[PDB]
Each structure stands twice: as C-alpha cells, then as structure tokens.
Amino acid sequence: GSSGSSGQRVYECQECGKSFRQKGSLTLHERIHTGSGPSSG
Ligand SMILES: [Zn+2]
C-alpha cells in the first residue's frame, strides 16, 4: 500500500456472479449469457 499501487480490479461477471483471473475468461463466459434487455415490458 505504501510502496506500490493501491486498489485492485477483477473481471467479475455482473450477471450471475463469477470471478475470472483472465480477461478473456469472462468474455467467453458471456456466451452462455444471452439476455441483454427487459422481458416483462
Ligand atoms: Zn455469468
């Protein structure tokens, strides 16, 4: 925290909730996630 960069960010799925060490890992996970938009309207 003193000697270095503070904070951290990870590619966590904001749909089901899944952390991915790699960036592509999440991108490929989006495949199963096919539903961008409302349903009851
Ligand atoms: Zn997901």
Swiss-Prot record:
Lineage of the species this protein comes from: Eukaryota, Metazoa, Chordata, Craniata, Vertebrata
Family statement drawn from the similarity comment of this UniProt entry: Belongs to the krueppel C2H2-type zinc-finger protein family.
Residues of the full protein shown: 74 to 101 of 273
Domain of life: Eukaryota
Protein name listed in UniProt: Zinc finger protein 32
Zinc finger motifs (C2H2-type), residue ranges: 11-33
Natural source organism: Homo sapiens (Human)
Positions of disulphide bridges: none
Function summary: May be involved in transcriptional regulation.
Binding site residues for Zn(2+) 1: 13, 16, 29, 33
Localisation: Nucleus
Coiled-coil ranges per UniProt: none
